[PDB]
Amino acid sequence: TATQRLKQDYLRIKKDPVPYICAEPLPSNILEWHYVVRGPEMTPYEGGYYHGKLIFPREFPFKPPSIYMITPNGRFKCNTRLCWNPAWSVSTILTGLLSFMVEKGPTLGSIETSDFTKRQLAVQSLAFNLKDKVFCELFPEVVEEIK
């Protein structure tokens, strides 16, 4: 079951967190998870906070989620689908997404910008996410972090 697996993935990521990431299911829907990525140091994302979502099909773990980023970031186009081992958890998926984010290669959903726009968006992400009621309500500790 998608839901029984996602429940496991939740306990697992909460028990054994991964660097730069926080993830929460929607209280009204386990098949939709939101995440926050903190931009690592020594990248143009440094100082940024990037909100996105995963939307899991009923067929999960045997089919991958759809991945979206919501925060303007300079790397991925917003609100659009981005880029199988069913053992991969929500943790592995988020860690892989960030690995991809920090590289320079292209995929479905990538955009080409300059490092100084990326840097301006990282400054802009703080206020962008604070005006987002869903961000604030899912990630109350990151709000405190950002503030």
Q: Which residues participate in catalysis according to the annotation?
A: 83
Resolution in A: 2.0
DSSP reduced 3-state for 124: helix
Q: What are the strands of the beta sheet with 21-26, ordered from one edge?
A: 21-26, 29-38, 49-55, 66-69
Degrees (nearest 5) of the Cα angle 66, 67, 68? 125
Q: Which two tokens stand for residue 9?
A: 């993935």
Tell me the one-letter amino acid at 97. Answer: L
What is the separation, in whole angstroms, between the first and last Cα of the chain?
Answer: 39
Q: CB neighbours of 96 closer than 8 A, spacing ≥ 6?
A: none
SS3 content of the chain, % helix, strand, coil (to 5): 40, 20, 40
How far apart CA 68 and CA 140 sit, in angstroms, is: 21
Q: What are the domain boundaries of the chain?
A: 1-147
**1-147: CATH number:** 3.10.110.10
Structural contact between residues 58 and 66, judged by C-beta atoms closer than 8 angstroms: no
